[PDB]
Amino acid sequence: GVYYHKNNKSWMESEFRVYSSANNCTFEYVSQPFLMDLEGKQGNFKNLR
């Protein structure tokens, strides 16, 4: 979830309730760092992944 707030023009998480909890974790990881555009402007798909 992302919202366009009038007071600050940025996109914050609204409800990160994807899951309830975790009983146990066999494995956890963080992938190499990289960056994102985070723009809501309308248009054709400028990139393919």
Which residues sit at the interface with another protein, rule CB under 8 A? 24-27
Task: Report the C-alpha gap between 12 and 22 in whole angstroms.
Answer: 24
Closer CB to another protein, 30 or 48, in the complex: 30
Q: How far is the CB of 24 from another protein (least distance, A)?
A: 7
Instruction: Report, in Å, the least distance between residue 23 CB and another protein.
Output: 12
Return the exposure string of 6-31: e unless at least 16 CB atoms fall within 10 Å of the residue's CB, then b: eeeeeeeeeeeeeeeeeeeeeeeeee
CB of 22 vs another protein, minimal distance in Å: 12
